[PDB]
Design an enzyme around this catalytic site. Structure first.
Site, PDB file in Angstrom:
ATOM      1  N   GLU A  89       0.239   9.957   0.893  1.00 20.34           N
ATOM      2  CA  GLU A  89       0.785   9.817  -0.419  1.00 20.34           C
ATOM      3  C   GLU A  89      -0.268   9.137  -1.195  1.00 20.34           C
ATOM      4  O   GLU A  89      -0.455   7.962  -0.939  1.00 20.34           O
ATOM      5  CB  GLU A  89       2.110   8.983  -0.475  1.00 20.34           C
ATOM      6  CG  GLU A  89       2.736   8.847  -1.859  1.00 20.34           C
ATOM      7  CD  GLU A  89       4.004   7.970  -1.850  1.00 20.34           C
ATOM      8  OE1 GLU A  89       4.965   8.407  -1.173  1.00 20.34           O
ATOM      9  OE2 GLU A  89       4.039   6.908  -2.429  1.00 20.34           O
ATOM     10  N   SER A 129      -3.643   2.642   5.205  1.00 18.89           N
ATOM     11  CA  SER A 129      -2.816   2.104   4.141  1.00 18.89           C
ATOM     12  C   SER A 129      -3.152   0.801   3.957  1.00 18.89           C
ATOM     13  O   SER A 129      -3.487   0.061   4.893  1.00 18.89           O
ATOM     14  CB  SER A 129      -1.283   2.188   4.494  1.00 18.89           C
ATOM     15  OG  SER A 129      -0.345   1.493   3.547  1.00 18.89           O
ATOM     16  N   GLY A 188       0.765  -1.222   0.000  1.00 26.29           N
ATOM     17  CA  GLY A 188       0.000   0.000   0.000  1.00 26.29           C
ATOM     18  C   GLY A 188       0.797   1.274   0.000  1.00 26.29           C
ATOM     19  O   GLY A 188       1.991   1.207   0.206  1.00 26.29           O
ATOM     20  N   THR A 189       0.217   2.478  -0.159  1.00 24.82           N
ATOM     21  CA  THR A 189       0.821   3.832  -0.298  1.00 24.82           C
ATOM     22  C   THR A 189       0.973   4.440   1.048  1.00 24.82           C
ATOM     23  O   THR A 189       0.199   4.324   1.937  1.00 24.82           O
ATOM     24  CB  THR A 189       0.068   4.729  -1.220  1.00 24.82           C
ATOM     25  OG1 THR A 189      -1.311   4.630  -0.968  1.00 24.82           O
ATOM     26  CG2 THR A 189       0.340   4.229  -2.684  1.00 24.82           C
ATOM     27  N   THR A 190       2.158   5.061   1.245  1.00 30.26           N
ATOM     28  CA  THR A 190       2.684   5.659   2.428  1.00 30.26           C
ATOM     29  C   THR A 190       1.681   6.583   3.105  1.00 30.26           C
ATOM     30  O   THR A 190       1.090   7.455   2.413  1.00 30.26           O
ATOM     31  CB  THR A 190       3.982   6.399   2.258  1.00 30.26           C
ATOM     32  OG1 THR A 190       4.921   5.672   1.465  1.00 30.26           O
ATOM     33  CG2 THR A 190       4.551   6.724   3.670  1.00 30.26           C
TER      34      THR A 190
END
Lengths: 105, 111, 245, 247, 244, 245, 232, 241
Positions: free
Chosen positions: F48, F76, F31-33
């Site tokens: 992010e 996330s 997943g994205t930060t």
């Protein structure tokens, strides 16, 4: 390496064991491109789209996709490769048939 | 105790012609010895060239109108855009009215 | 392969295998042909006599759903019993609610909604059928605002309108001929004999009236299931037509 | 393959989950019962695998009702629930139908009945334990019974169960008489159990109790002579010491 | 070994003991903390270590010691998920007993209903056993200082002192030698504070490591009450040890 | 590790773990930060959000959600798995308003959430959640920020991070804490929040991102949650660009 | 690996679910449709399939409401179910709140539906991708539904078999068609251009087109035959 | 194989579970009902023994279901417990409803249905119990049935279920007669039991007995489980002791 002899690894007779995994998404994108260079290359091909779709694929398996894309393209007689040809090249290298109509296709 | 109904007066009237048909009614709504409102549409177009008026006791009548309104849309969605006839409508409304029978609607309807 | 036992449950292609397998049940069954014409839809069927002790005209492969919606069937008659009942109820409640003859398109959808229950539990419609059904229908009728339609209900819950459609063993072969034999300008006597020409070729035995059972949807006659005297007369006229040629 | 449902039988018959449950029982502590003609003595030994742990906290001898106590051999956790479920069924089925505690014979059937359910369902395991239940009632006298995780019950004059069963059982066979006092029966009991362990045998760690004749002491109320005190009585360590010294 | 039935707690082994139920006794060393509780002569002290490996965590939310109800503590060893669920259940049980039966729920009755609850989780296949050792501490209305350790199998047994964790055995021997030489079953100190000091002394000895006021969390049962001490109250006790 | 023990989320392994529950954490890695920066007078969330095809409308897809009206959440991992967890968090908060007639305490919120993750690791037909959820806000007891792991474990934090670029993210987060002993003022912790995510986007260099920062502040939002927008978000972007070169 | 693909309640080591990835593959296997939009209008253009040339097609455009509607690509069974549920949500909004249900909220409820069966044992990820359009107060929106349940707002997207040629095309003209406003016709035109490049070994027919438009002052309408023969 | 559920069938149309459940009953002690036209005697052998087992104050394979029909037990005792209780309730339920006692044929049918249900429906074990029913009802007089664990029943004039089924049945039909007598019937059970059993003592402690007679009093029907000291007394007379 399970088949490999245990006494060769045993102790510091041989040092540093280095495992090469399956290509990552990053690695897949690069591997198709390079091979493509050798045949006809068009930029309508989105190589990121291809890298997502493939699951559990090796670099060996991808060289075959690049070559296959060329076989379908020649068959039709289009002297310039498409992205469409490439997408049809995943499912003829794999033993599956995606060419078979269904109950919604 | 509680009174689940009351009343709200008014007069509605349907005259059927022979190629035009009129459904008329007063906009006065009253309760007991108040005139609540001068203007208030009680004849509501429902589409498919059907007018509906449900007059008596406002609670019961506005709710029923609204519930029929929802049906006309459900009819187009499940019957692939078939217009409703007036007689077919007349039957739909019977099943809306009888659908509570132990707490029934208590408005005299004309379509 | 190893992805096929469950109904939930995929499948590297992306298809439900259980659902596709029920397609193959329909080919086990006896050939049924329907042809829409602008004068009515003719639903003929084949029957197959395992012994000439199975009484042909007590087995039902055409059934009445209402006075204007008919069905022919092929596949398991165990599955056709529940499948058909649902639709008979659909037409009768529609007349109750709206007084209007059920539209063929909506009558199909009711069948096919029932087809959709596969699981043993879902969000939305609550699934209570333990497997896909093992029966297709040809659904024929006439509504007033779209004329005559011929539909094919699938046990997979999808409906294709057709000008003509065959199911059963002889589906492939009938379908091949009907590609060369449908027209805008065909007529119901013509349809009737069209079904039998196609039928003899795809039946394993021979064409008799005992092993045939045609029926029509005409606005005038409503749904009329024929007799064997009627069906025999038509057979004798097919043979005359093929003699000249 | 027939082992691991409860639903699968062997070709030779029987269910494995019951068979494997019986294995479990035999791993538990050494417990034994001797029927006398004026009592029943029920006895077990205890441990905790750490001396820091107190030994009254545990109870491996529990009165089920005032006239009927029980012990076990087998898994610890399973006992504690099953005794709760048994007391609770004892009231439901019989302390509202007689308005007092049920006879011994009755309640053996009711506890045996919870076992039968813990086999009947699948995805629910049997209980891990075998009980001895001993109690006294006014029509069949003093009595003793074994209730197996099978959902079968067996009447017994004397029996033993648990790790030391096979050795205890042959010692009981020889030494039992048809007519013994409550007092003599206690001495056969402490002694039998001392086969199972020596040098760590003391009255502190040995729980030994009886269902004898009424005690007016634990009745707790006085002036109503038309009801009997608890037939059950738990003996203390110091009292077990008098009997162990007297051997 | 294996085959079935380390996959099931409703299916026995040829041993007669459930292998997955034994794994919950191997899932208790997962967070690598150790607990000590000892009995005074009107208090119970319980101390478990605090790990704050990174400065990102706030040492005030890192705890394993919980207030269960007014008179009842608990320290948990093993993972946080089963710790919360157990703690919740206990909070709910304590609360319930009161409206049914009136007065404050004894340490013993709480421990026993949670033990019976653990045994049920192993009875059914649609619920697994918990993954925690629960050590409950209270001073009882009529039995005074009491420690009951309830294990995730559904076994419960009392204590004079108990220790739990992966370094347990070392604290356990340390305690055997101590309670044996005194010839008593209690610590004879008569304030809660000098009993907290002694406990500090003994965990330092057994593990063999000096600890800090950011690496201890201490909950103290007195009669009628339970509290968890903050880091700055914990220091008072530490500086008392550090020069006597 | 070994075969089995994965498959079912209530099977305990010979290692004293439950593999299925670990395997979830690994899904969250991809997943994205996301980070949360706690303050002495607010909380800041920044995230992010990758833009992976440039036909996407800018500033319109977010993994920021509000809960009740005072608590921020950002997740996330797998996006729609993360939407369901915040969704049950809205029902719980809302229930809480009727019964006790007060906004949720942030620790009260954390307790309820922690139980829900524990229940979907507790059966054999539920699925362990494959998400972390950083969440918190400002309430009666000042600011608190918590992070819930897909294992069903949570703790309070002065700095929380999850996602891909989470190792880089922790290095900068620690620095913040040491140079700023008070715990950094909330205003400046927005500008700081941008820069830390910019450094984390160099481990994801291939794709464009869109910076969304939201906050909850006693001082500068009146103890309410609201997103950071317009000129304020612009400053945070400009600061971050500066200090990365 | 490939053995954890048996069920949906079980994860893989690297962490996926093979079933959701498979439901995803199915979208491609079915039909092709291309969505795009403008500040003033939203338009879906889709290829209808037929089994054979005695078949007369199966429609892929479901009018939801007079301000919302969708196309489908993949499994037709799956679609019938999600559409019926969505129609329920619009009528609900109308009934109780008197409000044309916002496209932003709507996708999120759709997402919530999706996840119920992904968590649970029984059910299955829905086997279809949907492109949902609507025109509310906040103008046009176009949403991309996935089997995971992720809902994604775009100016233009395309899904289904060999749909990337529409995506390369849309990308090229992106900002071009955004400026096109107040002219429904031209957005229909652009849309026909995008789905042409996608096709290959077939070209358009009167009965292959279904063009679905809602705009500023127009309801949702599904156009067919002689209303798609100005854009054949 | 096709062991794995009980709601499956096999390529031959057998079901391994029905066969396996059937073999369970030849693991548990002999049980014999012999019908005579002057009474039915039920006799059964125990499958447990030892000098400290109490078995001299108790029956555990002779149950009176109601007051005119009783069963002998063969099979698992756990399986047996529940179905005996259900069977007694339904026999006696009839009593309440119709104010006359249940007929023999209906009660066996009912309980067979319950048996069958565990195979037919759900994910449960079949019940491994073979009950020998001996009743009287005035419609057919004396009635002997036994029910299979498969869950069906057939009438009988003599039957043996439980261990050594084949041997017992051969023994019974060599010396049986249609005229017979109730007293010759008792002696016949005792005759068969000596041979069939693997215990050569064959004394009172191993033996259960009940005789159901309408020749006991006149116009009246008497079910008598004998007591242990009568069981001893009759062993001298047949000469086994």
């Amino acid at each position: 390496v399970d088949v490999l002899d245990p006494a060769l690894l045993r102790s510091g007779r041989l040092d540093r064991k280095i495992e090469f995994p399956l290509p990552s998404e990053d690695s897949r994108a690069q591997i198709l491109q390079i091979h493509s260079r050798k045949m006809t290359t068009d930029d309508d091909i989105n190589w990121q789209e291809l890298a997502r779709s493939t699951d559990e694929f090796n670099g060996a398996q991808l060289k075959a996709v690049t070559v296959e894309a060329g076989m379908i393209a020649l068959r039709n007689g289009q002297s310039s490769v498409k992205h469409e040809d490439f997408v049809e090249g995943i499912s003829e290298v794999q033993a599956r048939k995606s060419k078979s109509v269904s109950f919604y296709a | 105790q509680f009174n689940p109904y009351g009343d709200n007066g008014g007069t509605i009237l349907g005259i059927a012609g022979e190629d035009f048909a009129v459904l008329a009614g007063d906009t006065r709504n009253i309760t007991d010895y108040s005139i609540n409102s001068r203007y208030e549409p009680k004849v509501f177009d429902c589409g498919d060239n059907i007018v509906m008026s449900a007059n008596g006791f406002a609670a019961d009548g506005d709710a029923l109108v609204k519930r029929f309104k929802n049906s006309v849309k459900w009819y187009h969605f499940d019957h692939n855009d078939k217009k409703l006839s007036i007689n077919s409508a007349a039957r739909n409304i019977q099943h809306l009215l009888y659908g509570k029978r132990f707490f029934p609607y208590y408005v005299h309807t004309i379509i | 392969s190893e992805y096929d036992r469950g109904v939930s449950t995929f499948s590297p292609e992306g298809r439900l295998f259980q659902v596709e397998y029920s397609l193959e049940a329909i080919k086990l069954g006896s050939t049924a042909i329907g042809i829409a014409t602008k004068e009515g839809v003719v639903l003929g069927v084949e029957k197959r006599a395992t012994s000439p002790l199975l009484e042909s005209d007590s087995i039902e492969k055409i059934v009445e759903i209402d006075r204007h919606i008919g069905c022919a069937m092929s596949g398991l008659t165990a599955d056709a019993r529940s499948m058909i009942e649902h639709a008979r109820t659909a037409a009768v409640t529609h007349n109750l609610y709206y007084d209007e003859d059920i539209n063929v398109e909506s009558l199909t959808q009711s069948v096919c909604d029932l087809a959709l229950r596969f699981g043993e539990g879902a969000s939305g419609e609550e699934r209570l059928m333990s497997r896909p059904f093992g029966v297709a229908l040809l659904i024929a009728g006439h509504d007033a605002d779209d004329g005559y339609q011929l539909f094919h209900a699938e046990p997979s819950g999808t409906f294709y309108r057709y000008n003509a459609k065959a199911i059963g063993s002889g589906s492939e072969g009938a379908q091949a001929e009907l590609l060369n034999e449908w027209h805008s300008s065909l007529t119901l006597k013509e349809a009737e004999l069209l079904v039998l020409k196609i039928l003899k070729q795809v039946m394993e035995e021979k064409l008799d009236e005992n092993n045939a059972q045609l029926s029509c949807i005409t606005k005038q006659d409503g749904f009329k299931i024929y007799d064997n005297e009627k069906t025999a007369e038509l057979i004798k006229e097919l043979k005359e037509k093929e003699a000249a040629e | 393959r027939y082992s691991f449902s409860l639903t699968t039988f062997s070709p030779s018959g029987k269910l494995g989950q019951i068979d494997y449950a019986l294995t479990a029982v035999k791993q538990g502590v050494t417990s034994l019962g001797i029927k006398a003609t004026n009592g029943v003595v029920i006895a077990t030994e205890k441990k905790s695998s750490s001396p820091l742990a107190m030994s009254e906290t545990l109870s491996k001898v529990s009165l089920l009702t005032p006239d009927i106590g029980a012990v076990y051999s087998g898994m610890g956790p399973d006992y504690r629930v099953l005794v709760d479920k048994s007391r609770k069924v004892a009231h439901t089925s019989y302390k509202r139908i007689y308005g007092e505690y049920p006879p011994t014979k009755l309640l053996v059937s009711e506890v045996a009945k919870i076992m039968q359910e813990a086999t009947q369902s699948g995805g629910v395991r049997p209980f891990g334990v075998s009980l001895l239940i001993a109690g006294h009632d006014e029509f069949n006298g003093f009595s003793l019974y074994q209730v197996d995780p099978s959902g079968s019950y067996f009447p017994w004059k004397a029996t033993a169960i648990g790790k030391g069963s096979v050795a205890a059982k042959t010692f009981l066979e020889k030494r039992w008489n048809d007519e013994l006092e409550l007092e003599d029966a206690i001495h056969i009991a402490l002694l039998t159990l001392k086969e199972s362990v020596e040098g760590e045998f003391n009255g502190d760690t040995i729980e030994l109790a009886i269902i004898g004749d009424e005690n007016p002491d634990l009745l707790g109320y006085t002036g109503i002579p038309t009801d009997k005190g608890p037939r059950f009585r738990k003996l203390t360590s110091q009292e077990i010491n008098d009997r162990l010294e007297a051997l | 070994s294996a085959a079935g039935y380390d996959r099931h707690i409703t299916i026995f082994s040829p041993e007669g003991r459930l292998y997955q139920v034994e794994y919950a006794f191997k899932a208790t060393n997962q967070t690598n903390i150790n607990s000590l509780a000892v009995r005074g002569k009107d208090c119970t002290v319980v101390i478990s270590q605090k790990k704050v490996p990174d400065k990102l965590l706030d040492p005030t939310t890192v705890s394993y010691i919980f207030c269960i109800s007014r008179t009842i503590g608990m320290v948990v060893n093993g993972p946080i998920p089963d710790a919360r669920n157990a703690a919740l259940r206990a909070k709910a049980e304590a609360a319930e007993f009161r409206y049914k039966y009136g007065y404050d729920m004894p340490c013993d009755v709480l421990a026993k209903r949670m033990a019976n609850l653990s045994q049920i989780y192993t009875q059914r296949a649609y619920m697994r056993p918990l993954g925690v050792i629960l050590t409950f501490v209270s001073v009882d209305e009529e039995l005074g200082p009491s420690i009951y350790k309830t294990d995730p199998a559904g076994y419960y047994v009392g204590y004079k002192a108990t220790a739990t964790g992966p370094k347990q055995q070392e604290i356990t021997t340390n305690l055997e030698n101590h309670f044996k030489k005194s010839k008593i079953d209690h610590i004879n100190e008569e304030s809660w504070e000098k009993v907290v000091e002694f406990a500090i002394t003994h965990m330092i000895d057994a593990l063999g490591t000096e600890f800090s006021k950011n690496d201890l969390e201490v909950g103290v049962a007195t009669k009628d009450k339970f509290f968890t001490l903050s880091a700055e109250n914990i220091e008072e006790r530490l500086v008392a040890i550090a020069e006597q | 590790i070994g075969t089995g023990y994965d498959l079912s989320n209530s099977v305990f392994s010979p290692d004293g773990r439950n593999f299925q529950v670990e395997y979830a954490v690994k899904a969250v890695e991809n997943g994205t930060t996301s980070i949360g920066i706690k303050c002495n007078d607010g909380v800041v969330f920044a995230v992010e959000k990758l833009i992976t095809s440039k036909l996407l409308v800018p500033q319109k897809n977010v993994k920021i959600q509000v809960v009740d009206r005072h608590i921020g959440c950002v997740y996330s991992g797998l996006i729609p798995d993360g939407r369901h967890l915040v969704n049950r968090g809205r029902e719980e908060a809302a229930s809480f308003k009727k019964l006790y007639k007060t906004p949720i305490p942030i620790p009260a919120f954390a307790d309820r959430l922690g139980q829900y993750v524990q229940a979907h690791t507790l059966y054999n037909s539920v699925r362990p959640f494959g998400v972390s959820t950083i969440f918190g806000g400002v309430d009666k007891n000042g600011a608190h920020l918590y992070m819930l792991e897909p294992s069903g474990s949570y703790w309070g934090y002065k700095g929380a991070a999850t996602g891909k670029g989470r190792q880089s993210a922790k290095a900068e987060l620690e620095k913040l804490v040491d140079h700023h002993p008070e715990g950094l003022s909330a205003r400046e912790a927005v500008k700081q929040a941008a820069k830390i995510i910019y450094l984390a986007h160099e481990d994801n260099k291939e794709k464009d991102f869109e910076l969304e920062i939201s906050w909850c502040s006693l001082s500068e939002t009146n103890g309410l949650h609201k997103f950071v927008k317009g000129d304020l978000l612009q400053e945070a972007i400009d600061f971050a660009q500066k200090e990365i070169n | 690996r490939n053995n954890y693909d048996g069920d949906t309640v079980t994860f893989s080591p690297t962490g996926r679910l093979f079933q959701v990835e498979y439901a995803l593959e199915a979208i491609k296997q079915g039909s092709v449709t291309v969505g795009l939009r403008s500040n003033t209008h939203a338009v879906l253009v889709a290829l209808k399939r037929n089994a054979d040339e005695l078949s007369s097609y199966q429609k892929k455009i479901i009018k939801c409401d007079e301000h919302m509607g969708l196309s489908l690509a993949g499994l037709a069974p799956d679609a019938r179910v999600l559409s019926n549920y969505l129609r329920q949500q619009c009528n609900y909004s109308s009934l109780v709140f008197n409000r044309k249900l916002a496209v932003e909220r709507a996708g999120h409820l759709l997402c919530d539906k999706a996840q119920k069966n992904t968590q649970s044992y029984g059910g299955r990820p829905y086997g279809v991708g949907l492109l949902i359009i609507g025109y509310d107060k906040s103008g046009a929106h176009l949403l991309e539904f996935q089997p995971s349940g992720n809902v994604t707002e775009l100016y233009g997207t395309a899904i289904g078999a060999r749909s990337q040629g529409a995506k390369t095309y849309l990308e090229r003209t992106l900002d071009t068609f955004i400026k096109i406003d107040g002219n429904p016709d031209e957005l229909i035109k652009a849309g026909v251009e995008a789905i042409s490049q996608s096709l290959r070994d077939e070209s358009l027919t009167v009965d292959n087109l279904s063009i679905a438009i809602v705009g500023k002052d127009t309801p949702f309408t599904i156009y067919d035959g002689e209303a798609v023969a100005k854009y054949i | 194989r096709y062991d794995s559920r009980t709601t499956i069938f096999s390529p031959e149309g057998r079901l391994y579970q029905v066969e396996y459940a059937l073999e369970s009953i030849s693991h548990a002690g002999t049980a014999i009902g012999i019908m005579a036209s002057d009474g039915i005697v039920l006799a059964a052998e125990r499958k447990v023994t030892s000098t400290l087992l109490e078995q001299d104050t108790s029956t555990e394979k002779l149950y009176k279901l109601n007051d005119k029909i009783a069963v002998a037990v063969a099979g698992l005792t756990a399986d047996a417990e529940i179905l005996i209780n259900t069977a007694r309730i339904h026999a006696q339920n009839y009593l309440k409803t119709y104010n006359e006692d249940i007929p023999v044929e209906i009660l066996v049918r009912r309980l067979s249905d319950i048996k069958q249900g565990y195979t037919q429906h759900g994910g449960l074990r079949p019940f491994g119990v073979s009950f020998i029913y001996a009743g009287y009802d005035d419609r057919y007089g004396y009635q002997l049935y036994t029910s299979n664990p498969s869950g069906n029943y057939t009438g009988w004039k003599a039957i043996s279920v439980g261990a050594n089924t084949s041997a017992a049945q051969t023994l019974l039909q060599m010396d049986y007669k249609d005229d017979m007598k109730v007293d010759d019937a008792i002696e016949l059970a005792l005759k068969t039991l000596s041979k069939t059993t693997d215990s050569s003592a064959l004394t009172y402690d191993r033996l259960e007995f009940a005789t159901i007679r309408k020749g006991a009093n006149d116009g009246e029907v008497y079910q008598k489980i004998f007591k242990p000291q009568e069981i001893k007394d009759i062993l001298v007379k047949t000469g086994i002791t």
